[PDB]
């Protein structure tokens, strides 16, 4: 086994800083090089620079130059990656990958991510609002729930706490000008149950630490 | 050192022979590596020098180039392989390669949610557009207000392609203030998608 384990997320405020660890266990810590990787939302991978573990020695990609730190601690084969100065492109996933040698082309075992969510707004919980149906759509109904107005990612939504999953369309959140989310969850029933059949969302947004369960009924 | 990879995006069946070929601007010897990513997943290392396949990789994964070709090929096709595929040149990453999985043309199933009472009171109002179950993915969304087209107001997002049928979903939303959304009476969601137009509507109040 080859393994490399990342600390959790991270929100921060523009202009301060994020530091993300990447904890290593199954082979030696000092024979491969460590790389940082980051991806923003819908774009793709791009590196940010490496540092051998042997003597602490970084080579930073020069858009990052002066701005990332990367050190290491030999006594528990983790590499630290620090980025100052935070923006809103900064926001992505990081990931902490490997190469052999003194190489950077072959990245053979990666990080599971760390999502850094960068922006001036602070940590709100959501606010459900119900998608209520009427039926003008022969047998099948559409009925959902708007998650609105959310910070930061992500949140998980359920329907009759995971008994309802046919049919079921949890859509990518949308970034507002607000600067908060907002994604929306629908579900397709049999038209003949919308008066009868309890429909429940049930949205949980650990980072808030808030759930909310919604009733939607018909109108 | 610079990247281009092609196609953007294709749409290929189980069983299919698929290339994927991304060139650099500048001699690069053999430094070229494949991954494959999967949506909400982590980038896994398929081909490293040029054509030497990373142990565990299936042989239907090949590697093939010289000077600033350097292709990549599936012999057959697989379910588990529809993903993004990037090269890596150096430092630099592509833009990555859409593998979808080819289908019949689907009608959408459009729904049209009007704002919510209970939004209406903290003063904005969000009408919701529901795409069910349509492909290609390639599909237009447009709102009008009163028989007036909107342009500027409102987003979107797509879901990953479903894995019993192979069609996509699509939300959008149209934000309104409340006084705004008031104003008017006629709202209506657009869906144009291969010599198909269709238009669910409704009236506040009705």
């Known amino acids: 086994q080859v393994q490399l384990v990342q600390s959790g997320a991270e929100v921060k405020k523009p202009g301060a800083s994020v530091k993300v660890s990447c904890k290593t266990s199954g082979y030696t810590f000092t024979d491969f090089y460590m790389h940082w990787m980051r991806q923003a939302p819908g774009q793709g991978l791009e590196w940010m620079g490496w540092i051998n573990p042997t003597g602490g020695g970084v080579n930073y990609a020069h858009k990052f130059q002066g701005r990332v730190t990367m050190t290491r601690d030999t006594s528990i084969s983790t590499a630290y990656m620090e980025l100052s100065r935070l923006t809103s492109d900064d926001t992505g996933v990081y990931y902490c990958?490997?190469?052999?040698?003194?190489?950077?082309?072959?990245?053979?075992?990666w990080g599971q991510g760390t999502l850094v969510t960068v922006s001036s707004a602070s940590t709100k919980g959501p606010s459900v609002f119900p998608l209520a149906p009427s039926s003008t759509s022969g047998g099948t109904a559409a009925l959902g729930c708007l998650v609105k107005d959310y910070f930061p990612e992500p949140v998980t939504v359920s329907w009759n706490s995971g008994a309802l999953t046919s049919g079921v369309h949890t859509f990518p959140a949308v970034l507002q000008s607000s600067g908060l989310y907002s994604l929306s969850s629908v579900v397709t029933v049999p038209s003949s149950s919308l008066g009868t059949q309890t429909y429940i969302c049930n949205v949980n947004h650990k980072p808030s630490n808030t759930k909310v369960d919604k009733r939607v009924e018909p109108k | 050192i610079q990247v281009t990879q092609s196609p953007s995006s294709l749409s290929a069946s189980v069983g299919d022979r698929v290339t994927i070929t991304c060139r650099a601007s500048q001699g690069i010897s053999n430094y070229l590596a494949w991954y494959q990513q999967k949506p909400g997943k982590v980038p896994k290392l398929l081909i490293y020098?040029?054509?030497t396949l990373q142990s565990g990789v299936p042989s239907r994964f090949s590697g093939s180039g010289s000077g600033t070709d350097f292709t990549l090929t599936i012999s057959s096709l697989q379910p588990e392989d529809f993903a993004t595929y990037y090269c890596?040149?150096?430092?630099?990453f592509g833009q990555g390669t859409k593998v979808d999985i080819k289908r019949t043309v689907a009608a959408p199933s459009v729904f049209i949610f009007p704002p919510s009472d209970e939004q209406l009171k903290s003063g904005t109002a969000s009408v919701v557009c529901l795409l069910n179950n349509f492909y290609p993915r390639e599909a237009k969304v447009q709102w009008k207000v009163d028989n007036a087209l909107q342009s500027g107001n409102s987003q979107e997002s797509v879901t990953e392609q479903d894995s019993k049928d192979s069609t996509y979903s699509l939300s959008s939303t149209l934000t309104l203030s409340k006084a705004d959304y008031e104003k008017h009476k006629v709202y209506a969601c657009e869906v144009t998608q291969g010599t198909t137009s269709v238009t669910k509507s409704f009236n506040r109040g009705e």
């Open positions: 990958a490997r190469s052999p040698a003194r190489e950077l082309l072959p990245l053979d075992y």
């Open positions: 890596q040149i150096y430092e630099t």
């Open positions: 020098g040029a054509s």
